[PDB]
Each structure stands twice: as C-alpha cells, then as structure tokens.
Amino acid sequence: IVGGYTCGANTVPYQVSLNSGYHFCGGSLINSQWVVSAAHCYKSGIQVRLGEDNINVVEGNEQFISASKSIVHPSYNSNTLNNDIMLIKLKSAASLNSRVASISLPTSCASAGTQCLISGWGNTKSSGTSYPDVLKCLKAPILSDSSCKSAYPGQITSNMFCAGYLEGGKDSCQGDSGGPVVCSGKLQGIVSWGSGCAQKNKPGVYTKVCNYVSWIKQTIASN
C-alpha cells in the first residue's frame, strides 16, 4: 500500500496473508472455512495466515491453516485478468471472534464516489521494493467508469472497477494482490492490477465482486 497508514493490530479482522514460506498475496475471510483472493495469486502449497498484524513475528491471535483446495474461476483469463477471483477452502475451520471475523458479500454493486478501505502488506514504494512488517490501510474512492476507461482504454471489462487517486501517491501495489476493498462493510473489490503503483492517472483496478456473488455462493455450496 503506498501513501497509506498503519491499520492498528487486528482492526481488519477479515484480512488474511497467503504464505508459501513468505507473504505473496492477501485474501479476505468470508466464512470460517473459505477465503476469496485473486486467481493470479494461485499456486499450490498455500498456508493461510489469519489474525496477523506483523507477518515476521508471532505476537498472538494468529491461526495458520493450510488450504484444502483453491478454485480459480473457470473463465479466468491470465492475459486480461478478467474474472481474477479464486476461492480457497481451509483444511479446518478458523475460530471466529473479534480479531478474526469474516466480511459480508455485497447485495448491490457500489457507485463511483463510494469511499472504501484497502489493506495489505504489499509494497509501500512506487519506485523500488519496501515491504512492511505490519498491515497498512488506505481509504480510496471508487472512480466513475469513464475515468476508469480513459485511464486504461480497452483494458477494463464489466468485471473490474477502478478506485484510487488520479493525482498518484496513494494506491495498492504488488503484495496487496488478492486482498480486500471493503465499502460500507461489504467486500466490493479484490486488489487485481494497475500500471505501476501510485502513478498519476493510473489507478488500481479491482475485481467487481458483486458480479460473482451467485458464483461464490453456488461454488461454496457444491464443495
């Protein structure tokens, strides 16, 4: 997260760290046995870390659970990153409470101007790699489709939305991938891609979760 602030331990109880011997992507806890992340964060050998704050120190509240299966959306396209969403089932359920809690899926899509909270342990520099030890937060507004399309002409599908600051300086970045964009308490986006990080006129692009609610529900139900 570039230009964001330290969230405060456990103030984002649905945030998860996907770890394969190092933190590589974020994710969101949606029920005690399932996490939603981005399909491009897929890989085998994933350990899901819940209740984390500083990822290099065990300080208490952490639950490390291995993934039972990862289900990448069947129409995920790695070239365009359309349908960039993945569900991960955990080998055992997590114990939910106040430091570990699931976030709700939306009932409607959000509008441009809605303010949302983006969080993650991703890069904090737009030029160079500086990965933090504790969770960073950023409040960003959803942009209108016209500003999103003027910024990425020909690359925005109806399953994506832009959120951020066109002046640059504040944005999600590599490492934040797969994590949550929560607005009014509902999971509305998944960190997916962008051109560089915090560059002027190049906002972040997020998977539009409201378009996958029926799929998430049917897939969890049948697995």
Ligand SMILES: CC(C)COc1cccc(-c2nc3cc(C(N)=[NH2+])c(F)cc3[nH]2)c1[O-]
């Ligand atoms: C291990 C894999 C997850 C590799 O994934 C990646 C490798 C390099 C960069 C990214 C990445 N840059 C990103 C930049 C932005 C942005 N400007 N708001 C974003 F929203 C997601 C990004 N994801 C990324 O997701």
Ligand SMILES: [Ca+2]
């Ligand atoms: Ca820790």
